[PDB]
Amino acid sequence: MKASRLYTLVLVLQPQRVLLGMKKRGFGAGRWNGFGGKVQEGETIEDGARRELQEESGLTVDALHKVGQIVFEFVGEPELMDVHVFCTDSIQGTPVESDEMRPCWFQLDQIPFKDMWPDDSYWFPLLLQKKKFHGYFKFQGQDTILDYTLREVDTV
Numbered sequence: 170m171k172a173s174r175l176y177t178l179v180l181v182l183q184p185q186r187v188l189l190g191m192k193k194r195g196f197g198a199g200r201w202n203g204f205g206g207k208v209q210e211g212e213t214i215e216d217g218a219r220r221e222l223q224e225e226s227g228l229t230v231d232a233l234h235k236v237g238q239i240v241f242e243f244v245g246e247p248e249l250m251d252v253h254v255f256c257t258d259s260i261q262g263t264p265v266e267s268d269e270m271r272p273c274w275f276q277l278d279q280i281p282f283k284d285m286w287p288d289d290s291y292w293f294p295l296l297l298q299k300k301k302f303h304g305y306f307k308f309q310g311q312d313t314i315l316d317y318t319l320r321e322v323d324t325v
């Protein structure tokens with residue numbers, strides 16, 4: 170069996186738009202995404218998600234809601250990425266560019282799927298329907314999915 174490392178992913182989803190950030194360097198650079206990163210020792214997953222949102226987008230929220238979990242496996246990488254996905258609709262400041270991310274709002278009929286991780290085409294629609302989900306995706310490199318599972322769940 171493989172070990173996994175905890176990561177977070179945060180989507181600010183409002184009734185007509187979603188906040189994404191263009192990843193400027195590092196993992197997933199060049200793709201629009203939610204905000205997030207590695208959970209640190211001692212913090213809850215939700216608190217790590219709140220922290221990453223603030224660090225990468227400038228937004229401070231008091232509460233996030235867990236909407237899904239996605240496990241990523243890469244060919245040649247023994248460690249799995251266990252990504253805990255959170256949403257909120259409620260913000261009260263403006264996003265600001267960070268070293269990691271350039272935030273930008275997208276209308277919900279203009280989700281930039283071609284410039285997002287390929288797996289997002291499968292699970293993001295569930296997030297938009299306010300459904301909860303568990304997923305797993307195995308990648309060869311950055312572009313090619315070799316195997317995946319996706320299921321709606323009632324509890325994440």
Ligand SMILES: Nc1nc2c([nH]c(=O)n2[C@H]2C[C@H](O)[C@@H](COP(=O)(O)OP(=O)(O)OP(=O)(O)O)O2)c(=O)[nH]1
Binds near residue numbers: 177
């Ligand atoms: N939408 C989407 N997000 C993904 C996928 N794979 C994946 O790791 N993520 C998310 C989880 C995290 O938010 C981010 C990966 O973490 P990261 O490398 O940015 O972590 P970090 O901020 O701690 O890294 P760093 O600043 O130290 O370089 O990308 C995917 O296929 N789709």
Ligand code: NA
Binds near residue numbers: 205221
């Ligand atoms: Na980060």
Ligand code: NA
Binds near residue numbers: 205206207269
């Ligand atoms: Na990050």
